[PDB]
Design a protein around this ligand. Structure first.
Ligand SMILES: CC(=O)Nc1ccc(Br)cc1
Length: 129
């Protein structure tokens, strides 16, 4: 893509420690799966392309971008050590949306729908075994 967009967040790095946990499996099989197929998921399924969207200030405002395409790759390629790292990525994605956009904007109502589902599923994150 455009040189004016930053590289996406890291999804592969042999130096980073990684482990499978039952909680991370739940985050893939339940949480990501639930959110990915929601009617309002599509704006969140890949990094923001600030050039295509004509948002030249996006990556000036949002210095820790995150999206569900990145999270999906991190889960499927076993990038994480623990569930907290992945939950933080989802929280970062929502908070970026809420910081960049006006309350009540369509993109914010879409994010809020996904976050409500997220919260319900994370309240049920299984005990680590
Ligand atoms: C994820 C996100 O904020 N995307 C986005 C989409 C459209 C506009 Br307009 C602003 C931002």
């Amino acid at each position: 893509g455009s040189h004016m967009n930053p590289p996406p967040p890291e999804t592969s790095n042999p130096n980073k420690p990684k482990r499978q946990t039952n909680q991370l499996q739940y985050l893939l099989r339940v949480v990501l799966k639930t959110l990915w197929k929601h009617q309002f998921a599509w704006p969140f399924q890949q990094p923001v392309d600030a050039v295509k969207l004509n948002l030249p200030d996006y990556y000036k405002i949002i210095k820790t971008p995150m999206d569900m395409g990145t999270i999906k790759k991190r889960l499927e390629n076993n990038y994480y050590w623990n569930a907290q790292e992945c939950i933080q990525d989802f929280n970062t994605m929502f908070t970026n949306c809420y910081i960049y956009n006006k309350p009540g904007d369509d993109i914010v109502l879409m994010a809020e729908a996904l976050e409500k589902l997220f919260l319900q599923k994370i309240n049920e994150l299984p005990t680590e075994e």
